[PDB]
Structure formats: C-alpha cells, structure tokens
C-alpha cells in the first residue's frame, strides 16, 4: 500500500539507497493518488540524488575528454564512457518527465503543487539540455523554458516572493537562462528582482527561503 | 585487453562509479595474470567502496530498528530491509573471496604480493563476521591474518606500508569481532614502536598515515 512504500522510502533515504527510494516513490505516484506535501518531497529528493550522480559523473568524464585531446584512445574511452552515462542520464529524466506528465501535473489541484511539478519539469528537461548534442536540443530547451515560464507566471501571480517554491523557481530559471540559453543578463535580472522583491516583502519555512536567497546572491556574485 | 580494462578502471574511479570499476578489475583478475602493484590497488579500492556502501547502509538500518521496539509493523520492514542489504553484502564478499582463492592467492609470486592478497582475505571474512556459521567465518578470517603476519614480520621492515597496514586491520579484528580489546593494543603498539625506532620517497605517505591511524585506534580503544 501507500504508507508501506512511503515508510520504506524513508528507510532507503537514511540508508542512502536512492535507487530503492526512487522506485518506492515512483510506485506511490503510479497509483494515481495526488501526492501529499511530504510524498512529493521524497520523490524529488530520490530522483535528484539518482540524477545527480550521473550529472556529476558526466562532468568529470566530459572534462577528461576535453583534456585528453591528442590521445585518441584516452579520449575515445572517455567519449564512450560519457555516452554510456548520457544514456543512463537520459533514461532517468525521461522516467521523471513521463511520471510528471501522466500522474503529477494533471492531478495537481493546488497552485503550490502545480508550480512545484512544473519547476520539476523544467529542471529535468534542463538536465537533458546539458547533454543534448543537436537537432533535439532546440526542442528540449524550448520544452524546459515553457515549463519554467508557466511555473513563473503562476507563482508570481499566486505566491509571495518569500515563498520558497517561488524563490527556488527563480533560482533554477535564472540558471537556465545563464548556462543553457547563454543569456547571462536575463539570468542576473531574474535573480536580482526575485531577491529584491523578497526583501521588499520582508520590508517556519523561512529557513529554506533564507537559504535560496543566499544562493541567489551567490549566483549573482559568481556571474559578475 | 588488459590496458583497456585498467584504463577504464582508472576512468571509473574518477567518475566515482565503483561498480564499473570493480567489474573491470574482476575481468583483469579473471584473466589469471598476476596483478601489478597498481592493479591490486585499483582492485582493492574498487571493492572497498562497493562493499563499504552496503556496510554503511547496514549500520544505519539496524540502528533504526533498535528504536522500533514500540511498533512491531515498522520492526518487520526494517528487518526485511536490513536482510536485503545483508544478502547484497554477502554476495559481494563471496565474489571477492572467490577471486582471492582461485586467481589471486594461488599465483602470488613475489613476497609483497603474497602479503597483500592474504590481508584482503581476512578483511572480507571480517566483513561477513560483522553480519552457527559465525565462528566458522571468524576463524577463517584469523588464519589469513596470522599467515600474512608471519611473512611480513620475517622478510619486511616495520616501515613498509603493507606490513603496517596488515597490523592495523589485524588489530581491528580482535576488538570488533573477538571482543579482545587488549591483545590487539599490543599488536598495534608493537608495529608502531618497531617503526619509530627506524623508508622510500614512494612509501612515506602510506607508511606514516597508517601509523597515525594506529595511535588513533589505540586512543579510541583506551577510553
């Protein structure tokens, strides 16, 4: 049942076995039931750790491929190993995106849930964009922006700049403009406005809100 | 080829994908050739991360069930989950122990090679002992330590890192498994004191690091 899979997923998180944690929360969503405020956090933390290992491995192997130019063997090995990580990375994102489109986004009856899943949809399309080679990158980048844009319009309309979902969405959206679209100016504009509007509204969950605001100012300092 | 498997193993270590790293070194061991000083380190680091991820997961799940005395439902799930990690942990060690007794320890040529694979045997039996067959695994673990301790004591210097590393893992075996916190402190202190009385540029780091861990084990045990 649901409570059995959720409790086992909480055990897999403590044991740091996120592949077991992901399969448990995937089954909870595949039952057609709208997730609670805790079940969607477990599903997110699960696949983010699963997808993060491939991303971290992809960056290292890709850096080696760029650095091993001149030695075709050391560079082709890195190329082929990277391509295998890419296939693992693509299957994970397609698993989450198909999970978001079939069960999560349609059943979302609250704007809080809808912005969360839409931001999550823009993220895993952005993770596919970091790896795309061509022909399909144009659409993947567009599909990532559309999910981000719809999430940004709902959040800015029905959430406050102190809400952690809106701040985190502005953080990931600005990263999308900077690293994917190569627009380092709208990235700073998105991050600075969301950071200043959060202070101006300031002018429980505030621990997450303060952390994201520090991440916004840090991205601004790095991009400058 | 041997070069491709090792090169990918070095590459899998950088990507932190030790399941692929262990599978490559297992294929190098399956080819029967005696592993070089670099290959035996890559094989060890590979399976140490693979077998250590299940050890860390096992310590967490069992510690959670100790506080679940009130609820019998959660106690079953934690018990069932712990047993699945135990089955994973058993299959990993038996995989290493099979390679040790079939390809590795048999073809052990030079002395330094014979001592390293002999230490690795007692370790993965010690990992099995951490989880009737108990005394059978514990004694099977002890003989590999003693056999390697005699060889390293007779033909190696107390400054060699393989001799110092074996003394460290042997001392841990007495404390955690045999519950002998005192017969091990002598072994750790003798191997430490026999080295301070006395080494190459390619060996100080591994040698001096183990001695630091030796005195750190002695301090921890003597609370």
């Amino acid at each position: 049942d649901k409570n059995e899979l959720v409790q086992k997923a909480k055990l897999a998180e403590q044991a740091e076995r996120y592949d077991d944690m992901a399969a448990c929360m995937k089954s909870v969503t595949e039952q057609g039931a709208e997730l609670s405020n805790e079940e969607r956090n477990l599903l997110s933390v699960a696949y983010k750790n699963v997808v993060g290992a491939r991303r971290s491995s992809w960056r290292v192997v890709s850096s080696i491929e760029q650095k091993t130019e001149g030695a075709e063997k050391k560079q082709q090995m890195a190329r082929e190993y990277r391509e295998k990580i890419e296939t693992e990375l693509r299957d994970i994102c397609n698993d989450v995106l198909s999970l978001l489109e079939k069960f999560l986004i349609p059943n979302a009856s609250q704007p809080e849930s809808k912005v969360f899943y839409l931001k999550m949809k823009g993220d895993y399309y952005r993770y596919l964009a970091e790896v795309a080679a061509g022909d399909d990158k144009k659409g993947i980048v567009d599909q990532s922006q559309q999910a981000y844009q719809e999430a940004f319009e709902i959040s800015k309309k029905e959430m406050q700049p102190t809400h952690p979902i809106r701040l985190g969405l502005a953080l990931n959206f600005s990263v999308f403009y900077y690293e994917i679209l190569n627009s380092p100016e709208k990235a700073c504009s998105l991050a600075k406005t969301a950071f200043d509007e959060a202070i101006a509204e300031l002018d429980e969950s505030y621990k997450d809100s303060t952390l994201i605001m520090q991440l916004l100012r840090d991205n601004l300092t790095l991009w400058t | 080829d041997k070069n491709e498997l090792v090169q990918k193993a070095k590459l899998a270590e950088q990507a932190e994908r030790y399941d692929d790293m262990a599978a490559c070194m297992k294929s190098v061991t399956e080819q029967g050739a005696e592993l070089s000083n670099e290959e035996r380190n890559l094989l060890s680091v590979a399976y140490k991360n693979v077998v250590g991820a299940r050890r860390s997961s096992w310590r967490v799940v069992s510690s959670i069930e100790q506080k679940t005395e009130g609820a019998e439902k959660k106690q079953q799930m934690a018990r069932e989950y712990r047993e699945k990690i135990e089955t994973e942990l058993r299959d990993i060690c038996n995989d290493v122990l099979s390679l040790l007794e079939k390809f590795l320890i048999p073809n052990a040529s030079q002395p330094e090679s014979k001592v390293f694979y002999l230490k690795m045997k007692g370790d993965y039996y010690r990992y099995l002992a951490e989880v009737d067959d108990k005394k059978g695994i514990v004694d099977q673990s002890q003989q590999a330590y003693q056999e390697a301790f005699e060889i390293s004591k007779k033909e190696m210097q107390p400054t060699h890192p393989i001799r110092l590393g074996l003394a460290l893992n042997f001392s841990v075996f007495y404390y955690e498994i045999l519950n002998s916190p005192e017969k091990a402190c002598s072994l750790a202190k003798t191997a430490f004191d026999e080295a301070i009385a006395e080494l190459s540029e390619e060996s100080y780091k591994d040698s001096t690091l183990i001695m630091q861990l030796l005195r750190d084990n002695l301090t921890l045990w003597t609370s």
């Binding site: 985190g168 990931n172 990263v175 690293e179 | 460290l168 921890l220």
Partner: peptide
Amino acid sequence: PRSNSWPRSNST
C-alpha cells in the same frame, strides 16, 4: 565554479 540550483575503529 558551477551555478547554484535548488567513534568507529578505523581500518585501511
């Protein structure tokens, strides 16, 4: 640099 998004006995 990357952009930001949202006791025991020792052995050898």
